[PDB]
Amino acid sequence: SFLGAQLPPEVAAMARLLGDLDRSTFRKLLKFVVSSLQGEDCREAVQRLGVSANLPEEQLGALLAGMHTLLQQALRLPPTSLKPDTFRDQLQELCIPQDLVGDLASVVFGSQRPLLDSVAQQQGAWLPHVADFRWRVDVAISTSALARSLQPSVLMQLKLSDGSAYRFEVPTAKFQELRYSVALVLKEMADLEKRCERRLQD
Amino acid sequence: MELSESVQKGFQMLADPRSFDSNAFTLLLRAAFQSLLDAQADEAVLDHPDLKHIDPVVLKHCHAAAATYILEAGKHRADKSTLSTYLEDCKFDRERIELFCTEYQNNKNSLEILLGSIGRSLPHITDVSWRLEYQIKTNQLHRMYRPAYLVTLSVQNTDSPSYPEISFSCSMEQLQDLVGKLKDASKSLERATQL
Amino acid sequence: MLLELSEEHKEHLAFLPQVDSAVVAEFGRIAVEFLRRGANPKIYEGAARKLNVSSDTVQHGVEGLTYLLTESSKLMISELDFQDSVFVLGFSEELNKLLLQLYLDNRKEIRTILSELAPSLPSYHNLEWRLDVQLASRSLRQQIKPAVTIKLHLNQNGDHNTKVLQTDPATLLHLVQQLEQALEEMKTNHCRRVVRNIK
Amino acid sequence: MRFRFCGDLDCPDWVLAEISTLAKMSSVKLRLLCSQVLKELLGQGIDYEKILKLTADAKFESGDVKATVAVLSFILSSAAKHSVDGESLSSELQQLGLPKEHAASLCRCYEEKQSPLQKHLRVCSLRMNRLAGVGWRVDYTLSSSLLQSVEEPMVHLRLEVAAAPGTPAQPVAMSLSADKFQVLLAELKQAQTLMSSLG
Amino acid sequence: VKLTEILELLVAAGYFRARIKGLSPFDKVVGGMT
């Protein structure tokens, strides 16, 4: 099962609560789960839904926790690996009512999915990225130590997505090492991609 | 629970039928709770037209006495038996003892939620995420071919200057060690439920 | 695959056949000693006078030999590919066999040193935990508030850092669940193929 | 299978593995090695020279030694953690396949140091901070530009706080009005009354 | 019982749960093969 070898306790709890729940309330809750996955703050809207449904907060918490887990584990699977027929079968082993299964399936496979995939791909980053890169190229004509220098250098400034920024000067012997290193890594990324496509894809 | 001589004299004046009738006692008592719990700093909270005959120095003294006893009774989790004992000591009559308990019981939950919201605490972990990578090469070393985990904890507290995420890396042995520690901790919560 | 010795790197190594293999064995000893501990230029002027060559001749030969061992260990080049790399140099079988043994004797230790150079990410060291129940505060006198106090120890750049943190019970059950799913991934058929095929 | 010294859990696979390395020593030197690790747990240092000198009996390599010290430290600490007696420990180490003579020896050393171990393990248990000391000065104020005559006492406090053992204490220094000082002392006495009701 | 031949093999492989006195022969043998 896409839920792993042993059913998470929050999913088992939620699946027995669904028998008592009006489909109108289920579909209202499901929107909050999906929009929370896209990063939207929903806390006040959930509270209003609670008193509207007369759900105590102990049951809201169990329902919301169980729905989040089910969608998280399904949406992390590529379309090669979970497909509508096997998803629908596996959810029926949880004894989820068939009408609610259709609503869940529409979230995992319908037109909501591409925006969810975009948000899920953002979470692979762990180190910061280059946000900006600026330079100037200078030639030194004279200096305190030399009447004539005539030596080039590159002044560089990086801004990272961390919000950190660095300004530093690069000797041309050091720029050659940087340029070499970057082209080398690009060759070795391309070689690794060809290993993967010819051995891991089959 | 101890109460200063200033607070006790304020209650001794609320106990009078002369100084306060049963109507004024109720209105001042309600104003006491309101001024504690309302977010509006209602400076006119004492300007009730039935309170207007009381000496404004006495009125404002008994209002602060009531509010001070309410906070002390709340903090010390006072039961009705404790409340009724202290009121009868201050010579309250059976009607006003009932009135004080009725207002206190109505507000008890709001007061206890307020008193419990005051404090500072450690940074609270709220979530975790992980990445699995296979390590290929370094500019100094080929054929590394070892997995690493990249773990981030999300913390959510502002009681002291802090940064919201803690990021670190684990080998297979380091992540297996870490998980064992957290399950050891979780097994101790289970034992504590057997108390 | 094979080593691409630069022309200057070849020219430095050309000193090796100019002297007895017993001296090349001494160059091998001092070469790996420098990798192990650090270089000490004071020996180069000694060997120079003993061999009737310049100190730069000794330095270039020995530092060239260290680089041969270092690049071989970095690549983990096979014994067969090593020979096919070295036979671009013209010297005789006795020296070729000496160099091959000097490589295989030391590649595993050198690779341990070379692993210290990688980009220095922060990493896990240790974790401590304590189960606390808060029973009173200045403002409110009877309570039960259970929490797990956590002390997380980390390394970066060889410097230890520590962070003191807190969770409630239900969050701690979430933390274990997620990081158990992390460990489960290395057992999945996808990651098994990577380990099996990317080698 | 579950074991008391493991905390009512099945034995870790690295522990069950390295219990077979303990069987490789003589029973007479397994007991001597326990004494060295147990001294370290009691804070009395560790003698790596002696550990290596006796384990030469079994011709251990340094990976054997590391794994042997690690498993003895785990067994002894975790039995003491859960207050397991040597009678239980001997019986349940034998279930894991440790020879009966080796089981014996190992538990007659635990039996001797069980009580001082638990006192040390309580001292080592997780702390966020420790109050190392207190200093105070009381001043009397005579006059000011801001108030022509003052005539009030004032207090200065310095609190030494230690974050970790083997580190210098941080001073927290502050000044207080005599009213602020009075209320602080009275509040600390109320906290102490609650503390004394717990233990 | 002929187990000693194959349990010596599983221990020598590094499956040490063949040593635990308390598991049944099926768990040792079939568990160790797995």
Per DSSP, what are the bridge partners of residue D137?
A: D156
d(CA B97, CA D88): 62
Q: Which residues of D are less than 8 Å from C137 in CB distance? A: none
Q: Which of B175, B162, B153 is nearest to C124 (CA)?
A: B175
Q: Are strands C159-167 and D130-141 parallel, antiparallel or unpaired?
A: unpaired
A8 shares contact with chain C (CB less than 8 Å)? yes
- Do chains D and B have 3 or more beta-carbon pairs under 8 angstroms? yes
A3 Cβ neighbours under 8 A, 6+ residues apart: A11, A70, A73, A90
- Name the minimum distance, in Å, from the CA of B49 to any CA of chain C: 35
The Cα–Cα gap between B34 and B28 comes to 10
B95 Cα distance to chain centroid: 31
Tell me if B129 and A192 make a contact (CB, 8 A cut-off). no
Beta carbons of B14 and B65 less than 8 angstroms apart: yes
Distance from C-alpha of A175 to C-alpha of A172, rounded to nearest angstrom: 5
Using an 8 Å CB-CB cutoff, list chain B residues near A126. 131, 150, 152, 167
- Residue pair B121/B159 in contact by the 8 Å Cβ criterion: yes
**E16, E21, E22 ranked by CB distance to D16: nearest:** E16
Minimal-distance CA residue of chain A relative to C181? A4
Residues A153, A169: contact at Cβ < 8 Å? Answer: yes
**Distance, CA of B25 to CA of B2 (rounded, Å):** 23
Q: Which of D9, D60, D35 is nearest to D117 (CA)?
A: D35
Task: Count Cβ neighbours within 10 Å for each residue of B126-146 and write b for 16 or more, e otherwise.
Answer: eebbbebeeebeeeebbeeee
Nearest to A77 by CA among A61, A63, A90, A58: A90
Rounded Cα distance, B133 and D10, in Å: 31
Burial profile C73-109: b = 16 or more Cβ within 10 angstroms, e = fewer: bbbebeeeebeebbeebebeeeeeebbeebbeebbee
Q: At CB < 8 Å, which residues of chain D contact E?
A: 1, 13, 16-17, 19-20, 94-97
Asked if B187 is an interface residue toward chain D (Cβ–Cβ < 8 A), one would say yes
A-D interface (Cβ pairs under 8 Å ≥ 3): no
Residues from chain E that touch D1, judged by Cβ atoms under 8 A, are 20, 22-23
Distance from CA of B184 to the nearest CA of D (A): 9
Q: Six-digit token pair at D112?
A: 């001797």
Contact list in A for residue C199 (CB cut-off 8 A) is: none
d(CA B161, CA D109): 49
Q: Do chains B and A touch (3 or more CB pairs under 8 A)?
A: yes
Say if CB E7 and CB E28 are below 8 A apart. yes
Distance (Å) from the alpha carbon of B195 to chain C's nearest alpha carbon? 14
Angle at alpha carbon of residue D112, lines to D110 and D118, rounded to 5°? 70
CB C113 within 8 A of CB C66: no
* A8: number of Cβ within 10 Å: 17
* A4 vs C contacts (CB less than 8 Å): 181, 184
- From C170, B125, B185, select the one nearest A65 (Cα to Cα): C170
Q: d(Cα B174, Cα B130) in Å, to the nearest integer? A: 14
- Chain C to chain D Cβ contacts (< 8 Å): 15
Nearest alpha carbon to residue C65 among C94, C88, C31: C31
Of B124, B141, B178, the CB nearest to C127: B178
Q: Which chains touch E (3 or more CB pairs under 8 A)?
A: D
Please say whether the beta carbons of D16 and E11 come within 8 A: no
CA distance readout (Å), C106 to B50, B140, D63: 99, 16, 19
Nearest CA in chain D to B187: D7
Residues in chain A with CB shorter than 8 Å from the CB of B150 are 126
Q: How far apart are CA A152 and CA B32, in angstroms?
A: 78
Closest by alpha carbon to D72, among D120, D19, D138, D143?
A: D19
